Design a protein around this ligand. Sequence first.
Ligand SMILES: [Zn+2]
Lengths: 48, 284, 720, 83, 32
Amino acid sequence: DDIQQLLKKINELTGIKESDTGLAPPALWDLAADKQTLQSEQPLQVAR
Amino acid sequence: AVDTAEQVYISSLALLKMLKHGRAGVPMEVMGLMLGEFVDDYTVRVIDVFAMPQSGTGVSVEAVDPVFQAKMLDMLKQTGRPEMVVGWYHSHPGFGCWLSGVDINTQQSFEALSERAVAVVVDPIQSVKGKVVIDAFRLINANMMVLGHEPRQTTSNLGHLNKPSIQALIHGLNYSITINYRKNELEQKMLLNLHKKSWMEGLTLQDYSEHCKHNESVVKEMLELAKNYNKAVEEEDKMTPEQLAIKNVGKQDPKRHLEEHVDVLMTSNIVQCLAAMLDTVVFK
Amino acid sequence: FQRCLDDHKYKQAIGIALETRRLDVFEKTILESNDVPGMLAYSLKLCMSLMQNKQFRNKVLRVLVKIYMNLEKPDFINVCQCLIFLDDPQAVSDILEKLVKEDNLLMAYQICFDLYESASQQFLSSVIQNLRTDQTLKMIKILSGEMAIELHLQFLIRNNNTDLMILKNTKDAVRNSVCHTATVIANSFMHCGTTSDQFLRDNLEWLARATNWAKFTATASLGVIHKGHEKEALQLMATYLPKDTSPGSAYQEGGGLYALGLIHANHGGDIIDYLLNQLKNASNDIVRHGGSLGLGLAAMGTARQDVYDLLKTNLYQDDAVTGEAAGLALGLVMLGSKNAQAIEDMVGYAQETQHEKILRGLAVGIALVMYGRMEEADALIESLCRDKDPILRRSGMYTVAMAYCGSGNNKAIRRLLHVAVSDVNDDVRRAAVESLGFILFRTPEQCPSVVSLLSESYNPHVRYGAAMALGICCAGTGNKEAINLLEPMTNDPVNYVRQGALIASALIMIQQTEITCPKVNQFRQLYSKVINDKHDDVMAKFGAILAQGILDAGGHNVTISLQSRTGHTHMPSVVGVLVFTQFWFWFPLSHFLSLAYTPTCVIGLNKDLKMPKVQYKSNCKPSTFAYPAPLEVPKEKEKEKVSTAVLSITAKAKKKEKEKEKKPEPNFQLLDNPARVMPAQLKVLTMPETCRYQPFKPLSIGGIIILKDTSEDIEELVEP
Amino acid sequence: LRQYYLSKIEELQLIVNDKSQNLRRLQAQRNELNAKVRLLREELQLLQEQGSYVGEVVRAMDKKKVLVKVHPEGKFVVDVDKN
Amino acid sequence: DLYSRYKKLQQELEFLEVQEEYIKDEQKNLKK
Ligand SMILES: [Zn+2]
C-alpha cells in the first residue's frame, strides 16, 4: 500500500509538463522577438 | 499639475437628464456636452447638461458641430448663465463603463481645449433598479514612461473609497474620478414622496369583504404553521440536538412562517380597526 | 452636622457639605480638626473629580485656597495648581511677590516650574507681564518656559537611543506606492526634537523623489525632528532658504516655513515678526500655506489682533489650499476664547464660500475657536448641528467635542451618540465617534463599554470611528480592554477601517511594554507582517507604517496624555490629537501629532540652573520599564536546506551505529538623574538617599522637581 | 451616617445593576439583527457579479496552462488561479 | 468614601442611561 501511495506522489510532483510547445526559439530571431512584435500589434488591424 | 482625490459634483437635474437621454436611445450611442463651473483646483462642478442630436457614425468629434454647439450655448445664456462647457455625456449601453481608443481620441481634443475637463460614461442598460453606473474618466498624460505612480498622487488626501471596478481593469485603465451628488434641500423636497406620498388616502377603510377573506386565507395557514410548530416542539428530545436543530431545513417555523404571519396579521387587523373608529367620529 | 462631628468621621461631613451647597460647613470641616492633614488632598481630589457645576466648583476651590493660605505653612504645589485653575494672574503675582519677600527659593522655583507645566499662555503670560510691571528676572525667565525648553530638549537628546534597523527594513520593503510619505512621517515621529536625523542626510535620492505636496512632507518632518532649538532655528531655516538653487520650488519653502513654525510650537519672539513679514510678502499660492501653518502654531493661543488681521485677510482671499490653511491658522490663533465677532465672521464665511477645502478646514478651525467652555458653546453647537451643509455639521460636532474636553458630560455624550446613529453624511457619522474620546478620555474606564457595541456596525465609514475613538480615549495607557476590542478590528475587510484601527492600537500601546499589555510584541509582529506583504491594502499599509513610527516616540521618551501629572489638560496635546484626528482629509497635517508628545523625564535641578548628578533606583515589583525594546539583532538567518526522509530497513543500521558511536532584571535596579520615568512607575520608584540632597517636593509624580539645597562642596558637580 | 449613606448606596446600586444586564439584552439582539443585515446584505453584492462558464478540460499543458472546451465556442488555453 | 461611592454610582447610572437610549436608537435604524 505504501508503494501504491508513493507512485502517486512521484508522478504528481513530476507531472506532465514541457508540453506547451508552439514557441519558435526566440534566439534565431531573438532580436526581433521583442517590441517589434508589439509594433506588429496595435497597428495592422485584423481584417475579416 | 498633478491630480489627487478630487470630487466632481453633478447636479440632480444633471443626473436625471443624463439618464433620460441615455435610455431614450439605448440601442444606439448618444452624446451630450456638459456645462458647468470650474470651482477650484480640486472641485469641478456641472450644474446642467445639454444633448446633441444623434448624428454621425457615433460618439466622435462630430458631436461638436459648431453650428449647433454655438447656438445652444448662446440662447442658453440669454436666460440663465454661461457655465463654460466642462464635459460630455457619452454612453455605452452594454459595454460596462470602459473607454475605447476612439473615445480616447475624442477626449484628447476636449482635453486640449480645456486643461482638466472630464469625460463621463453613463450606462443606460446595466444601471437599473437601484444602480447608477455613472463613472467619470480623464486621459492619463502621454508621458506615462516613468513618473510618480500615475498622476493620481493620492498623497494629498486619503479620499479613495470605492476602489476601481472590474471591467475597467480588463479594458484600458491606469483615471476614475470620484463622483459625489449634490442635493439641495429644496431639490429633494420635491422629487420626494411628492413623487408618491399618498395625498389624503390614509383614511380609506380597505374593501371590507376583501379583508374578511384575506384574514381567513392567512389564519387557515397559520393553523398549518401551528401543526408544524407542534411537530418541531416534540423535537429536541436529546438525540442529536445541537447539530439537528441547525441542520433541519424547511424554513424553521418561528422565523419565516409563524412570525411574519403574526406580524402581518397584527398590522392589517389593527390598521383597519383604527381607520374604522377614526371615521366613526370624524364624520357626523 | 453636629451629629457627624460627634461621630468624628468627617469624610461624610465633607461629602454632605459639598453636595448640599453649604460652604459654611465645608469651611468648618477643615477649620475644625484637621485629622489626617491629607484631608486637604482628599477635598482637592473629590472637588476636581466628582464635581461638574462650575458655578459651585469655583466657589469650593476658592474656599480651599482660603484654607490653604490660612494654614501655618501654605502648600506651594496645591496653591499653584488651584490658582492655575482659577485663572487669577493677580493672585499668582501676589503669591510670587510674597514669596520673593520671604525668599523661599526652593518653593519659588518649584512654583514657576509647576505653573509652566500646568497652566496655559495668557495665564503665564499675564503673570509674567504683571511681574515685569535681579531674581525677578530669573523668575520671569523660568516662567516663560524657555529654560524648561532647554532642559527637556537636553533630556530628549541625552536619551536619543533611537533605532534605525527597522527604518532600513521599511526602506527596503517600501515600494513607490504612497508609503514614501509614510516612511517620512515615521522618521519624523521617531526623531521628535532629537536633533539626530542621519538617514536623510546620508541618502538623498529617496528623500528627493516626491511631488509638490509630497515634498511638503519632508520639510515639516525635519521641523518636527528639530523641535525645540529656538537658539539657532532661524539660522537653520536660513541655511535652508528657498533661493539656494532655484526659487521655483515653492513647495520646499512653504514646507520649511511650516517646519519652523512647528519648531516654535507654543513659542514666539522675533520669529513671530519674521513669519508675519514672510506671509505679508512671499510667493503667490503655496508659500501662503506654509506661512499660515507656521503662524498658526507660532501664535497658538496668543490671540493677537495683528496676526488675527493678517490671517483674516488671507482667508477672505479665496484659494484652494490657502483657504483651508488660513482657517486652521485662525482657529489655532484664537483658541479657548469665544470671541463673539470672531465666531460670527468665521461661521458666516464658512457658509458663504464655495471651495470645498477652505471650509473643509474652517470646520475644525471654528470648532477649535472655542475650547472647553463646558457650557458657553450650546448656542454655537445647536446652530451648527442644525445646518444643512454636512461639513458645517461636522464642524459643530467638533465644537461640541472640544467644548467639553476633559469632562464626561452626559448631555454631550447623548448628543454625540444621537448624531452618530441618526445622520445622513458619512463624514459626520465618523466625526461623531472620533470626537467621542475627547470627552470620554479623562477617566478612561467607561469608553470601553461606550464603544463596545458600535465597533460592529454595517457602515465601515462609521466603524472606523471607534477605532480612533478608543485610540484617543485610552491614549497614554494600554488599558488592555481596548486591546481586546481592537484585536479583530485590525482584520476588517474595509481597508480604511483597518488603517484607522492600526494607528489607534499603536497609540493605545504607546511606550508600554508587556507590563501594561502583554500583546505589544504580538501587535508589532502583526504590523511588521502587514507592512511586509505586497498584497495588503495600500492605505492599510500606510496606517500600519504610521503606527510603527508612532509606536516609540522620541526614542521611547515622549508619551501622549492630554492632562498634566497634576491633571491639568494641555492645550497643545489636546489640539494635536484633534488636528491629527483630522487625518484622512489632508495627509500633510499628520505632523501635528508632535504637540501631544509628553516627555517622560525627571529633572533634579538643585542650583538656579545647574542639573546636579544623582543615581536613583527603582523598586517596582511586577513591572519593568525603561527601554526593554530588545530590537538589537540583525535577525538575518537563512538555512536553504532540505530535511531527510530516509526511512527504510536502514533505520536499524542507523540505530545500531548510533549506539555504537555513543557507547539582573529591571524593577529593582538603579537609574540616573535625568532618566526617563514612565508614568507606570512615577509612583513606585525608590528614593536614593545616598547623595547629599533630597527632593522637598513629594515624590509620586514626574517632571522637573527642585531638590532641597544642602551644604556646598558636594561631589560630582556636573552640568553636561 | 451608616444608616442613611449606606441606605442611598444600596438604593442606587441594586437598581443600577438592572440597567447593567439590560444593556446586554439591548446589546445582544442588536448584533443578532446585525447578523441579518449582513447575511442578507452581502448576498446581493455576491449575486450581481458576472457568472461563470462551464467547460471541459483536456490535456493540462505545462503547469499554469490548460485547454478547456467551451460549449458553443472553441477551445481556449485558459490560465489557472492561485487556489 | 461613603459619599464618593455614592457619587461614583450616580455618575455611572447617568452614563448607563446615556447608552440605554443610543442602543435603542441604533436598533430602530438597523430595523429600517
Ligand atoms: Zn465610447
